[PDB]
């Protein structure tokens, strides 16, 4: 059905159209923000047409558009897969993007370079979708590196600020450590089984496939902020709030989770790596959640929640439940996007206050965002019958029913109670409290560009879990049979998580115990991974270059040995041979010596 193929190729052409308009002089004359917002809107509708097709009958289309090099045995070609993962994600991503660009127009209003900002956001979407629908992994690499570079360009939008520059260099470094893993996997699949195309890599099921998948797991940990190198996604919040929503919140981070689902057929064979990520996903879930409890920056708390939810997503991939992990990716995108733009609304409406401490009683001052915030908060806490509930409790009870690390099982559940706690922290401090904002009040959220997108995503946050769960193909053969405590555990732990947090917030209002330091710190300054591993490594890695590798072995030792020594050896030799009295007697006698030696040279060799 060409309608299907053409549609998958068309979304890319339509989104690339804003990029070249800015290349030509035409954008000055038309409005770039409005034009870009409309075309993503049309791209979402175009994406819907294949999505309905896939629902009718499950067909997967591999589209080989262009050939790039024959390269002898390994031919390289540009291929877009249209498997359930690719088209489901393509639709969810563009809806979020359509929401954010409208938000972007309101948020960055008064920025002198709005058009460039919108331009990079769509370039990000083009790389993100290429990363999504990539058959051969070389294209997956183009997407993997591609979102990394544009994140660097967009985290540090405001280049002047060194803090933004530091975060951008952070993000590239963590991503590049991840890139080493993908290169290792790519090289192993460029040798052994031979083609970077997924359709053939999957014929490596009954092989070792540990050297390679360990590489992809390493790539995922860097891209998805698992316990190892978890800090750059918190650091990424130095970016503009809309950038934080579409890339820090949904498309960029889920890329690591998406890669492993693509390569799962291979993942199911190796038991060792499955528990490895189950284990690290579990550690990141709580580690990030505990850090979020004491953070006082609104954007920071949401970002930690982005990492904690992906930690749960990592856990399901670790328990070899790929389809549900993808289901959470889609539902995760709707609500996290909402909360970040919700705070975008609060931060912009207030005098750019990004701290929960000075922000209060937004519920009465701004009901529209507060309503959106609690809708999102409950979805994050898996309120029954909301989008989180359809996918999240499936994951919870999956854990409660599988054979798993006891430590992983316990931490994931309290991580769920912690998600309710920090969710409670945000609404109590941000919304339900006496106002503590600066005294002049100038709040307006009436702008259509704020409401509309927030309104549209809110509709998605309310109904998406209903629609996606029923429509997707039956998969995973879930276990609905459980003792009732386990069946309802997700619901109860979420309930008491808020209950306990609400209790603690009340304790704050009293006039007592101004200071409270119960390991609060470990929690508040990111588990101290940032304070220690960011000051030692960059210090011991640069000291060795300047002091040891550059000046010691370069410069002096490699210049005194080869280039300089040969300089000296000769210089000294000329000094002795050319220091001559000039007297004839001396010189002549040397002629005597010569005659003598030559007489002998003949004599002995007679």
């Amino acid at each position: 059905m060409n309608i299907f193929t053409t549609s998958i190729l068309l979304i890319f052409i339509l989104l690339l159209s804003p990029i070249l308009i800015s290349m030509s002089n035409l954008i000055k004359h038309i409005n770039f923000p409005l034009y870009t917002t409309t075309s993503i809107k049309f791209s979402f509708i175009i994406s819907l047409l294949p999505l309905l097709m896939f629902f009718h009958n499950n067909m997967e289309y591999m589209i080989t558009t262009w050939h790039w090099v024959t390269m002898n045995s390994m031919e390289l070609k540009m291929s877009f897969k249209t498997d359930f993962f690719s088209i489901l994600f393509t639709s969810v991503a563009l809806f979020v993007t359509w929401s954010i660009m409208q938000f972007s127009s309101w948020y960055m209003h008064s920025d002198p370079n709005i058009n460039r900002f919108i331009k990079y956001l769509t370039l990000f979407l083009i790389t993100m979708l290429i990363l999504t629908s990539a058959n051969n992994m070389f294209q997956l690499f183009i997407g993997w590196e591609g979102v990394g570079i544009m994140s660097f360009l967009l985290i540090g939008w405001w280049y002047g600020r060194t803090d933004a520059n530091t975060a951008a260099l952070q993000a590239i470094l963590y991503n590049r450590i991840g890139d080493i893993g993908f290169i290792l996997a790519m090289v192993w699949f460029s040798l052994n089984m031979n083609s970077w195309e997924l359709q053939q890599i999957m014929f490596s099921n009954n092989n070792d496939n540990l050297i390679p998948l360990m590489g992809l797991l390493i790539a995922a940990t860097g891209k998805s902020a698992q316990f190892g190198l978890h800090p750059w996604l918190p650091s990424a919040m130095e970016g503009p709030t809309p950038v934080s929503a579409l890339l820090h919140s949904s498309t960029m981070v889920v890329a690591g989770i998406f890669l492993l689902v693509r390569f799962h057929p291979l993942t199911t064979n190796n038991n060792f790596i499955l528990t490895t990520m189950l284990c690290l996903g579990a550690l990141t879930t709580l580690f990030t959640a505990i850090c979020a409890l004491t953070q006082n920056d609104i954007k920071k708390i949401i970002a930690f929640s982005t990492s904690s939810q992906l930690g749960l997503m990592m856990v399901t991939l670790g328990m070899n439940q790929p389809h549900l992990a993808f289901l959470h990716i889609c539902t995760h995108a709707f609500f996290k996007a909402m909360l970040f733009m919700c705070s975008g609304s609060i931060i912009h409406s207030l005098a750019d206050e990004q701290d929960i401490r000075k922000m209060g009683n937004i519920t009465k001052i701004m009901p529209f965002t507060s309503s959106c915030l609690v809708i999102g908060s409950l979805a994050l806490t898996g309120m029954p019958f909301l989008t989180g509930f359809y996918s999240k409790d499936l994951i919870i009870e999956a854990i409660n029913t599988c054979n798993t690390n006891a430590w992983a099982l316990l931490i994931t559940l309290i991580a769920t109670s912690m998600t309710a706690m920090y969710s409670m922290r945000i609404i109590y401090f941000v919304t339900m409290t006496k106002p503590r904002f600066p005294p002049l009040i100038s709040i307006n959220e009436n702008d259509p560009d704020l409401m509309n997108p927030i309104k549209r995503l809110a509709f998605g946050s309310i109904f998406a879990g209903f629609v996606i769960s029923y429509n997707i193909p039956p998969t995973s053969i879930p276990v609905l049979t459980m003792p009732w405590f386990l069946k309802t555990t997700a619901l109860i732990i979420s309930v008491l998580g808020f209950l306990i947090a609400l209790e603690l917030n009340n304790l704050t209002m009293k006039l007592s115990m101004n200071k409270a330091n119960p390991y609060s710190s470990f929690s508040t300054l990111l588990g101290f991974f940032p304070s220690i591993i960011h000051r030692i490594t960059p210090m011991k890695s640069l000291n060795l270059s300047l002091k040891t590798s550059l000046t010691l072995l370069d410069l002096i030792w490699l210049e005194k040995t080869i280039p300089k020594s040969t300089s000296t050896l000769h210089t000294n030799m000329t000094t002795l041979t050319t220091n001559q009295k000039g007297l004839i007697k001396l010189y002549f006698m040397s002629f005597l010596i010569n005659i003598i030696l030559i007489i002998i040279l003949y004599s002995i060799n007679l």
């Binding site: 002198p112 803090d163 704050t508």
Partner: protein
């Protein structure tokens, strides 16, 4: 940022600058307001007593134990305002603070529009060159009679003279370029 740094700090400015860090690091612990305003007038009490200690030695022994009490009772994430160091919005709108000596390489076409703008700009540049001599001379005639020099610069002291080394405190790129 405006005034110049004093060489050594007095006892007072060290005490009175703790009253700021302290009270401001007490409003991170006391997230609410009534609790804070309470727990803080109790802070002043601490500083209010031991105000009239005349025994310097003692005073510098209350200060040295105050700033260690504080270091161990500080909040890791205090409330630092935006536009202040470390916290956000600090260098945000610096990408848009171009340094104003760049409008001098504009093409005669660009400066063709925006006409009256450059008519006033050329006046100010006449002001700057018209006084560099009287300024530097002032800066010098009033030079220190000793090696003791502070970064403080003199006012005008005569009509028509423009308070010196002024071209970059005035003509500063505007804070929010937006």
């Amino acid at each position: 940022a405006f005034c110049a740094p004093p060489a050594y700090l007095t006892h007072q400015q060290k005490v009175l600058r703790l009253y700021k860090r302290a009270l401001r690091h007490l409003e991170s612990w006391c997230i609410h307001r009534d609790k804070y305003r309470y727990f803080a007038c109790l802070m002043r009490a601490r500083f209010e007593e031991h105000k009239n200690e005349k025994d310097m030695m003692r005073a510098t022994q209350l200060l040295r134990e105050a700033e260690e009490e504080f270091w161990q009772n500080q909040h890791p994430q205090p409330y630092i305002f935006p536009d202040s160091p470390g916290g956000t919005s600090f260098e945000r709108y610096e990408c848009y603070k171009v340094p104003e000596w760049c409008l001098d390489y504009w093409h005669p076409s660009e400066k063709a529009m925006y006409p009256d703008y450059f008519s006033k700009r050329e006046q100010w540049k006449k002001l700057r060159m018209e006084s560099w001599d009287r300024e530097v001379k002032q800066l010098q005639e009033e030079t220190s009679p000793d090696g003791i020099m502070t970064e403080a610069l003199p006012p005008a002291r005569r009509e028509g003279d423009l308070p010196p080394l002024w071209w970059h405190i005035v003509t500063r790129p505007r804070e929010r370029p937006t």
